[PDB]
Every structure is written in C-alpha cells, then in structure tokens.
Amino acid sequence: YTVKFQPDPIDKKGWSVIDFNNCCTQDGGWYLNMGWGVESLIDNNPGTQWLCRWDVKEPLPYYFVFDMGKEYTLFRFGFANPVAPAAHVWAGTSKAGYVEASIDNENWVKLKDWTSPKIGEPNVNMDVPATQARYIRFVITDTYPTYDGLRVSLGEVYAWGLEHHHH
Numbered sequence: 001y002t003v004k005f006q007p008d009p010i011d012k013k014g015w016s017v018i019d020f021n022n023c024c025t026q027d028g029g030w031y032l033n034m035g036w037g038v039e040s041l042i043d044n045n046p047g048t049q050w051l052c053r054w055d056v057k058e059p060l061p062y063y064f065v066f067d068m069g070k071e072y073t074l075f076r077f078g079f080a081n082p083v084a085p086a087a088h089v090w091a092g093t094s095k096a097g098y099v100e101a102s103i104d105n106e107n108w109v110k111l112k113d114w115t116s117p118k119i120g121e122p123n124v125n126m127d128v129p130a131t132q133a134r135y136i137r138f139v140i141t142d143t144y145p146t147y148d149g150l151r152v153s154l155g156e157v158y159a160w161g162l163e164h165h166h167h
C-alpha cells in the first residue's frame with residue numbers, strides 16, 4: 001500500500017497471454033472472428049473484451065499467465081470490466097480472486113487478493129508488494145451470478161512497475 005504515485009501502466013506491447021484455461025474460442029471457430037479471445041485482454045483498451053467458454057459453463061477458477069517480455073518490479077496491478085461497444089458488459093462479474101508473479105514461469109509468489117464490489121465495476125486496482133517479475137498470473141475465483149447463471153467477460157488487465165536494466 002503506497003501513497004499517491006499515479007505513474008503510467010507498463011506498455012503491454014511486448015506482452016502476450018502465454019497461458020490460460022478458459023475462453024470462448026476453445027469451441028467453434030466462429031467465436032474466433034469475434035475478437036473475444038484472451039489476446040483481447042492486453043490490447044490497450046477496455047473497448048475490446050474477453051469471453052469465457054460459453055457453449056459449456058466451466059467451473060471456476062479461470063486463470064491467465066501474461067508474459068510481459070522483459071523483467072519488471074510491479075508496484076500495482078488491476079483490471080477493468082468490459083465497456084461498450086463490448087458485446088458483454090453485463091458479463092463482467094469478477095468478484096474475488098488473486099494475482100501471482102514469477103520470474104521464470106516456474107516459481108510463483110502471491111501478490112494480493114483483489115475483490116470487486118459489483119458487476120461491471122469500472123476499474124479494480126490493488127497495491128502489490130514491490131516484487132520483481134516477468135510473468136503475471138491473474139486468477140478469477142468467484143463470480144457474481146447473472147440472469148443466465150455463471151457468465152463472465154473481462155475488459156482488460158493493467159500492470160505498473162519499474163523496468164529492470166535493459167542490459
């Protein structure tokens with residue numbers, strides 16, 4: 001928990017979801033042309049979204065392993081529920097979960113345990129203990145129920161931190 005620093009999120013261009021366990025793209029390729037895949041989570045804006053598996057409601061937890069490309073020292077981490085013209089703003093139901101961090105994609109260390117107060121919550125950032133990392137692991141553990149049961153869509157994930165020596 002740090003004071004009002006307000007720097008700017010790491011440019012997620014070298015980024016790339018290197019691993020996940022749930023998306024709508026798993027099924028028919030027609031979902032593919034919809035831009036609802038995991039990569040739709042680190043493309044700079046919450047305008048594009050990510051959709052869970054829809055043909056078969058999969059039980060939680062859902063996780064993702066982002067590869068920031070290089071090493072950093074995370075200060076904060078957060079995400080942002082979907083936002084118009086996102087086809088599923090009512091689906092952003094992330095309620096509880098946590099985020100881990102690793103430097104070799106083998107050994108991980110917990111950073112924090114986030115919790116969103118309502119469905120489709122604008123942004124949810126958390127102060128994460130000053131830790132060195134290359135890979136991040138986001139995990140949704142509980143979801144707010146919907147008119148159509150357990151559904152969930154994510155807008156985007158942000159990460160702050162210093163960049164280690166270019167070397």
Ligand SMILES: [Mg+2]
Nearest residue numbers: 040045155156
């Ligand atoms: Mg996005």
